[PDB]
């Protein structure tokens, strides 16, 4: 139904339940005027470290800002649809490998790993945009990036920083922290 999987293979049961909840929600509500062409790409269910879980919902690139136009309502509708598990919106971006002399179109820099990871981090939280990134390198050589979020709309996304760190460690693979500074604004 709502599943548009990029390869013609079998959608998962929890992803099918997500799509069924989305289609039932767009029938029972008035949002169907802005949900006729918007489609889910894929979904995943990971284990956030502790007693909580999270839902990752995959979004096509040219329909991203259509989901950002109504991102405020569907997160609380999926919170009241489920029990206590948080939900995020992450766009689906293809990652192209770095060319080598051992191995043709020129690879665009929007498909690079750094740009894809930065776009995933910026699209990870919508209501609070990033107003600064600091990278802490510890004495063992590992990287630990701390992310500053804006003062406006803080209490909506204050309790989700652990889930954001968990899903960013699962999708990307490096540790991230979040902070709300009080210096500028």
Partner 1 sequence: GRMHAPGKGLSQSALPYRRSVPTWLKLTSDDVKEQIYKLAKKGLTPSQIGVILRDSHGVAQVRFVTGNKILRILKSKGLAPDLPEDLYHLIKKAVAVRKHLERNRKDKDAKFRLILIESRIHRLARYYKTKRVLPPNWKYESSTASALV
Partner 2 sequence: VRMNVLADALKSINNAEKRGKRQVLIRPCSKVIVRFLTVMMKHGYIGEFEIIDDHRAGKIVVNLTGRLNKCGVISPRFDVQLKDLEKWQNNLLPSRQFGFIVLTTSAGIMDHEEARRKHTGGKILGFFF
Partner RNA sequence: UUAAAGUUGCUGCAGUUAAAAAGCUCGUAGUUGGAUCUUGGGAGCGGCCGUCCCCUGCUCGGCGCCGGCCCGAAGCGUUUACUUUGAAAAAAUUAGAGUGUUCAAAGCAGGCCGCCUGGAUACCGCAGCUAGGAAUAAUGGAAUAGGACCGCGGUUCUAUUUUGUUG
Show the site string, 84-123: x = touches partner 2 by CB under 8 A, - = not: ----------------------------------------
- Of the listed pieces 37-45, 126-134, 135-143, 167-175, which binds partner 1 according to CB under 8 A? 126-134
Please report how close the Cβ of residue 151 comes to partner 1 at its closest, in angstroms: 13
**Which of 97, 152, 155, 184 is close enough to bind RNA by CB under 7 A?**
97
**Contacted entry of RNA, partner 1, partner 2, none for residue 138, CB cut-off 5 to 8 Å set by kind:** partner 2
Residue 177 CA to its chain's centroid (Å): 16
What is the enclosing helix (H) or strand (E) of 73?
helix 71-81
Token pair of 20 as six digits = 């069924």
Please report how close the Cβ of residue 64 comes to partner 1 at its closest, in angstroms: 13
Distance CA 176, CA 182 (A): 20
Residues in binding contact with partner 2, number by CB under 8 A: 9
The single-letter DSSP state of residue 110 is G
| Contact (Cβ atoms closer than 8 angstroms) between residue 60 and residue 40 | no
Return the closest-CA partner of residue 45 out of 94, 86, 4: 86
Token pair of 82 as six digits = 């489920």
- Residue ranges in contact with partner 2 by CB under 8 A: 132-139, 141
- Residue ranges in contact with RNA by CB under 7 A: 95-109, 112-114, 140, 142-143, 173-174
């Amino acid at each position: 139904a709502k599943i548009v999987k990029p390869n013609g293979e079998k959608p998962d049961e929890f992803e099918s339940g997500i799509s069924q909840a989305l289609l039932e929600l767009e029938m029972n509500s008035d949002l169907k005027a802005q949900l006729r062409e918007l489609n889910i790409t894929a979904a995943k269910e990971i284990e956030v470290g502790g007693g909580r879980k999270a839902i990752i919902i995959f979004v096509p690139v040219p329909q991203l800002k259509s989901f950002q136009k109504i991102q405020v309502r569907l997160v609380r509708e999926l919170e009241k649809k489920f029990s206590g598990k948080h939900v995020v919106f992450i766009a689906q971006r293809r990652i192209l490998p770095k060319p080598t002399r051992k191995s043709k179109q020129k690879r665009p820099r929007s498909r690079t790993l750094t740009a894809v990871h930065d776009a995933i981090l910026e699209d990870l939280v919508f209501p609070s945009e990033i107003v600064g990134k600091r990278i802490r390198v510890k004495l063992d050589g590992s990287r630990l990036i701390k992310v500053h979020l804006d003062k406006a709309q803080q209490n909506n996304v204050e309790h989700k920083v652990e889930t954001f760190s968990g899903v960013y460690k699962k999708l990307t693979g490096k540790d991230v922290n979040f902070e709300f500074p009080e210096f500028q604004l």
